[PDB]
Amino acid sequence: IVGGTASVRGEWPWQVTLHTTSPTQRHLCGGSIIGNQWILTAAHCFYGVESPKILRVYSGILNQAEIAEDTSFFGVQEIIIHDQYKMAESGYDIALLKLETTVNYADSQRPISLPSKGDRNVIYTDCWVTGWGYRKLRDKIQNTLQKAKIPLVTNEECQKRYRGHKITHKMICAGYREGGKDACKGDSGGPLSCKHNEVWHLVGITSWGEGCAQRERPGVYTNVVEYVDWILEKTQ
Ligand SMILES: N=C(N)NCCCNC(=O)[C@H](Cc1ccccc1)NC(=O)c1ccc2[nH]c(=O)cc(O)c2c1
């Protein structure tokens, strides 16, 4: 997260850190608890991941230093990638992780509500992007989870910024004209959370962008409300 600040312990309880064990253990992607056995993440995260066996999901984490060999984690039983996905930039950048065991909800780890089809005309003004990613383009994974308030840009405005791409209705963009605040390497799969009527909604999944926090380049997120039927179908 560029131009962000440290989160407080448990202020983003749906936020998970997805690790890989191959060749040595490292953070791979962010993700969100959407159910007892369900993590919503991005599809691009699993490029070259042959088996869900190398994956470890960690919940209730503030700092990466909390993860040692003796730390409990959730095994992955299945990676469900959307069947129309090819790559991040063309959309359908969504994946569900079926956990081996269920998550015991507490103040440190709880699910985030998915937006309803009626909320398609809601004007979200309290949107945050969270992750352990890069604080600059050339950096490293951060110990402490960062947060940044980012305003939603219209699909019409985002399209003018990405003239060589098609920004579809299944995408949502967020950013400042002048830049300085955005997701960066290591934040993908993660939530774009928006507070509406005292309730937090998973509005977007960190997907792609041209660099990180550049002027006139909003970050591009998967628009979750467009996948609530696919989420229902695959979670059955
Ligand atoms: N402006 C925007 N909104 N951009 C959004 C998209 C940002 N892209 C990402 O997050 C990529 C995607 C991606 C995710 C997984 C694999 C390839 C690409 N992540 C990484 O490269 C990434 C991820 C984990 C890492 N683990 C480490 O230990 C050291 C790393 O260097 C490191 C870097």
Ligand 1 lining (C-beta closer than 6 Å): 26-29, 44-45, 133, 141, 182-188, 206, 208-209, 212, 219
- The dihedral formed by the CA atoms of 210, 212, 213 and 215, expressed in degrees to the nearest 10: -40
Distance separating alpha carbons of residues 91 and 28, to the nearest angstrom: 20
Q: Which of 32, 44, 193, 201 is catalytic?
A: 44
- Check if 116 is active-site: no
- Check if 201 is active-site: no
**Is 161 within any annotated ligand binding site?**
yes
The closest residue, in CA terms, to atom 11 on ligand 1 is 185
Q: Where in the chain is the domain with CATH 2.40.10.10?
A: 1-12+112-226, 13-111+227-236
Experimental method: X-ray
- Closest Cα to residue 138, out of 213, 229, 198? 213
CATH 2.40.50.140 fits 13-111+227-236, yes or no: no
3-state secondary structure of 87: coil
- The dihedral formed by the CA atoms of 205, 193, 79 and 48, expressed in degrees to the nearest 10: 40
The closest residue, in CA terms, to atom 32 on ligand 1 is 186
**Is 92 within any annotated ligand binding site?**
no
The closest residue, in CA terms, to atom 17 on ligand 1 is 45
Question: Residue 92 C-alpha to ligand 1 middle, in angstroms?
Answer: 18
Show the beta-strand stretches assigned E in the chain: 5-6, 15-20, 26-35, 38-41, 55-58, 74-81, 95-99, 127-131, 146-149, 152-153, 171-174, 191-196, 199-208, 219-223
For Cα atoms 100, 116, 114, give the angle at the middle one, nearest 5 degrees: 30
**Is 162 within any annotated ligand binding site?**
yes
CATH number of 1-12+112-226, picked from 2.40.10.10, 3.40.50.720, 3.30.379.10, 2.60.15.10: 2.40.10.10
